Amino acid sequence: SPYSSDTTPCCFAYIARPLPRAHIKEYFYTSGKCSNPAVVFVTRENRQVCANPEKKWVREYINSLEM
Amino acid sequence: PYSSDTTPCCFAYIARPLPRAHIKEYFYTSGKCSNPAVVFVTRENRQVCANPEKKWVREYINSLEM
């Protein structure tokens, strides 16, 4: 949302084991307003999965989503 | 609702009360969020944050979902 007073998604736990890469189609980082600096993997059924950018598998997943 | 799925949080409350007729539903943001909040879901599907302690917010929720 463009509205300051509207909700924004935040993460409070990171997924431990990597979700199948083929089931992920997009990603974005949660707002800097959130307490945790997470990445969100958007799945095939549009689930918003939180992950830790510092973890190697997460870093590679993000890179593999480059154009 | 896995612990690792995102959940909506509020960081600012709408100051001016939005048109009550524009509201179709409401819910409370997770206690995991830093701020307590009532979210009014509008007919445009916006998720508007409001302060639960405000009089209008209280009277709004007391008269919705009926």
The shortest C-alpha distance from B2 to chain A (Å) reads 9
Label residue A60 left, alpha or beta by phi (over 0 means left) and psi (-120 to 50 means alpha): alpha
Cα(B3)–Cα(B58) distance, integer angstroms: 30
Contact in structure between B38 and B57 (CB atoms under 8 Å): yes
Long-range pairs of B15-20 with CB within 8 A, sequence gap ≥ 24:
B15/A5, B17/B56, B17/B57, B17/B60, B18/B42, B18/B48, B20/B60, B20/B63, B20/B64
| Cα within 13 Å of Cα(A46), Cβ side | 0
Q: What's A1-67's CATH class?
A: mainly beta
Cα(A38)–Cα(B11) distance, integer angstroms: 17
Residues of B with CB under 8 A from a CB of A: 2-15, 29-30, 32-34, 39, 46-49
Q: Which residues of B touch A5 (CB under 8 A)?
A: 10, 12-15, 48-49
Name the amino acid, one letter, at B57. Answer: V
Residues 6+ apart with CB under 8 A from B1: none
Pairing status of strand A39-43 against strand A48-51: antiparallel
Cα(B45)–Cα(A1) distance, integer angstroms: 11
Radius of gyration in angstroms for the set of CA atoms belonging to chain A, rounded to a whole number:
12
Question: For the structural domain made of B1-66, what CATH number should be given?
Answer: 2.40.50.40
Domain boundaries, chain B: 1-66
Q: A2: burial class by Cβ within 10 Å (0-12, 13-18, 19+)? A: exposed
**What is the token pair recorded at A29?**
């980082």
Q: State the method.
A: X-ray
What number of helices (H) and strands (E) belong to chain A? 1, 4
